[PDB]
Design a protein around this ligand. Structure first.
Ligand SMILES: *[C@@H]1O[C@H](CO)[C@@H](O[C@@H]2O[C@H](CO)[C@@H](O[C@@H]3O[C@H](CO)[C@@H](O)[C@H](O)[C@@H]3O)[C@H](O)[C@H]2NC(C)=O)[C@H](O)[C@H]1NC(C)=O
Ligand SMILES: *[C@@H]1O[C@H](CO)[C@@H](O[C@@H]2O[C@H](CO)[C@@H](O[C@@H]3O[C@H](CO)[C@@H](O)[C@H](O)[C@@H]3O)[C@H](O)[C@H]2NC(C)=O)[C@H](O)[C@H]1NC(C)=O
Ligand SMILES: *[C@@H]1O[C@H](CO)[C@@H](O[C@@H]2O[C@H](CO)[C@@H](O[C@@H]3O[C@H](CO)[C@@H](O)[C@H](O)[C@@H]3O)[C@H](O)[C@H]2NC(C)=O)[C@H](O)[C@H]1NC(C)=O
Lengths: 175, 95, 95, 175, 95, 175
């Protein structure tokens, strides 16, 4: 029951695949797109102290990953290298294929010795962590990520593609 | 239809995406000569069309609930087939 | 069509499965608050419906031969697309 | 060539996709389901001395895995830790994603100095090994499994899903 | 239609495709008894059919450009869905 | 924009699905096939001194793999074990699933030191490296491969498939 959006004459409306009339014609498989939107645009605070308080550790839930094709510029992105007091690395190492968010104006790198208390780090408000083009539910060590959400669309058939219109870093401690 | 219920919604959208059909300029399609992983993107701006951008942001907020539960069920680590399934489910409903 | 040949056939079927449809209670859809991997299943009983359960057990016994040969050919380590392929083959036969 | 089952009027029939009449109307992708059933229901003996004679070691055949969505309760389940005499572990380590069988009334834990003389352990009668929601042709170390087979179905269209109706361990040595 | 441009074109073609629906003897379908990975192939010769084999070689030389630009875009490490997507696109375009 | 080849009356023509009229209709998903062809049929030189000049090293480009179902016999195949002068391995270890080309009438083993200057070895002319039934853009260590390209086809419908019709090594020093 994943909602799917339909665009006609630059208006947006929700539609189950069953509700589609013949008017909202879907002719080719390249009309279907997935877009990942950073939630900085929804007014959230983006400083490191406020962002750290929205990530938490848990055990017993396996990670998951989903693909997204288009994205958005991020004004702030994060990079985490937290450690346990004994020197062990808390977060998992990045699996092959996950590189990092392609576009960030600023990248916050956080390193410290705050005690993690679980197997993985999740998002307490349900949002995803966005990498180059793979959205994940977990934080991976050393890889830049941007907080965001994913949406699915049926784009209009046109001679020009929908996605063709008008074509620093700081380090802080933690505990 | 969709109405935003979130503070300080951003009207603009500086997108980036990968062009599936490629540029194909001369020898640039050969990977030994092509651009690095950081250079395969194209980017633009959907200027001041807040009537559509504001809708997209709200749809993503609502789509998160359904997507998370779906990922909880599937046993595959990386999911790529959501759109293809919706293409099949569109055809199967038409007679 | 199917007829049971096994020495014994258990008529009951206590099943478990994972539901992905609908919406969860409150915050339960957030992974940080949701149940562990051992608590995502739902359970039921096809009480005393021997006429159907006996058929499933025999069909599974026969389906193994075709499935094993299929996995021999494929070079994908984990297969998830058998049902999707059959959906496509259904459509292409009566397009 | 994989058979596909169809349910109508609470009866089961075999019909490849070629023979489907419009009466057995497939309408949405939710109807297609894969079910994994255990061998215990077909009358097979399940004491450990009889179970181990049904698995054998071989080399030169890559392992394979297939997904299955619904399953059955298992009264007997097996966990294996076999070592060749020099102390090396014979069975492969479980890859990411493979996980124990969810529901198991009793779990037999078997360990001992087997003469295992192959690269992988296979089923000598063609049955799969059921792990979580992944059916495998090979045994993995330390993960519970139940012997079973997989079936494919086209479920009836209804307001209530078909799979919604009426909603200890022992340690033994080996050689 | 297609015209060979390569300096030389071999007219014969020995193939080694695998078979998914072979009529296996009683016990050959069980992996414990079946052939090793080097014995699952079937071989044959398309004798002296120059008119098709020459065209088939040329098409491959031209499909590299499109295929590699496609691989540059995808995040998948291994791709298996190219033919399935083309099947879906065939059905959808019959609108 | 990946072309499809359509066969009718033993003639080959290019026809994307955009213009695949009913005269060349599909009926089942087993008609679609992918064929991997070797470069040696197109007249390329195959001696080791001339073959190595068409492979080169680069960094910053992720490797990729694609599946192919049909193949061709290779008169010459290559196996590589290059090393840096310090003794380290120059090429990636083969991931699970890569098993080497199944049919090679002769196999060249090339093993010697070379000033490797990149993460991976690519093909300078855009060709793929054919491993078993997987086509890769990068050379893996110790696995036989044949240079080739991939083509996609829509086969004719018949009682007898398009296929099934009419049913050693040297070591070379390097520097
Ligand atoms: C989708 O957007 C909604 C808003 O339309 C987001 O709701 C936000 O939810 C969080 C909790 O998850 C709320 O935090 C709570 O706020 C109050 C502040 O007084 C307080 O009672 C609690 O301490 C707690 O912090 C937050 O206020 C709420 N935002 C708004 C604007 O109401 C929701 O998180 C978004 N969903 C996703 C997946 O991003
Ligand atoms: C599907 O069900 C049939 C019927 O139950 C299973 O057939 C069983 O196959 C095994 C292995 O070939 C037979 O074992 C053999 O039995 C005799 C002694 O009875 C002996 O000659 C051999 O040493 C061997 O053990 C078994 O008898 C046979 N069962 C019956 C009732 O005929 C079949 O294995 C099932 N298929 C799958 C994939 O589970
Ligand atoms: C598809 O086939 C064509 C030929 O039909 C292949 O073109 C060949 O491309 C290579 C690499 O660009 C050319 O090599 C160059 O040739 C000249 C003359 O020696 C020289 O300037 C350079 O040093 C370089 O070696 C080659 O000449 C050319 N072949 C022909 C006959 O023109 C093409 O590579 C094939 N594509 C694939 C993907 O295999």
């Amino acid at each position: 029951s994943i909602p799917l959006g339909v665009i006609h004459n630059s208006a947006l409306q929700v539609s189950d695949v069953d509700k589609l009339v013949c008017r909202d014609k879907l002719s080719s498989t390249n009309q279907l797109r997935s877009v990942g939107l950073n939630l900085e645009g929804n007014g959230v605070a983006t400083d490191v102290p406020s962002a750290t308080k929205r990530w938490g550790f848990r055990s017993g839930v396996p990670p998951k990953v989903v693909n997204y094709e288009a994205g958005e510029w991020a004004e702030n992105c994060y990079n985490l290298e937290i450690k346990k007091p004994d020197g062990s690395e808390c977060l998992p190492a990045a699996p092959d294929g996950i590189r990092g968010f392609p576009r960030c104006r600023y990248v916050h790198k956080v390193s410290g010795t705050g005690p993690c208390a679980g197997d993985f780090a999740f998002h307490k408000e349900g949002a995803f962590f966005l990498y180059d083009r793979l959205a994940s539910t977990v934080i991976y060590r050393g890889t830049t990520f941007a907080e965001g959400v994913v949406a699915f669309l049926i784009l209009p058939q046109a001679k020009k593609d929908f996605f063709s219109s008008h074509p620093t870093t700081i380090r802080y401690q933690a505990t | 239809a969709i109405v935003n219920a979130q503070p300080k919604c951003n009207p603009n959208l500086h997108y980036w995406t990968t062009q599936d059909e490629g540029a194909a300029i001369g020898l640039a399609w050969i990977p030994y000569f092509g651009p690095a992983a950081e250079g395969i993107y194209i980017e633009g701006l959907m200027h001041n069309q807040d009537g559509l951008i504001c809708g997209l942001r709200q749809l993503a907020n609502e789509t998160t609930q359904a997507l998370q539960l779906f990922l909880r069920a599937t046993t595959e680590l990386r999911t790529f087939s959501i759109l293809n399934r919706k293409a099949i489910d569109f055809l199967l409903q038409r007679w």
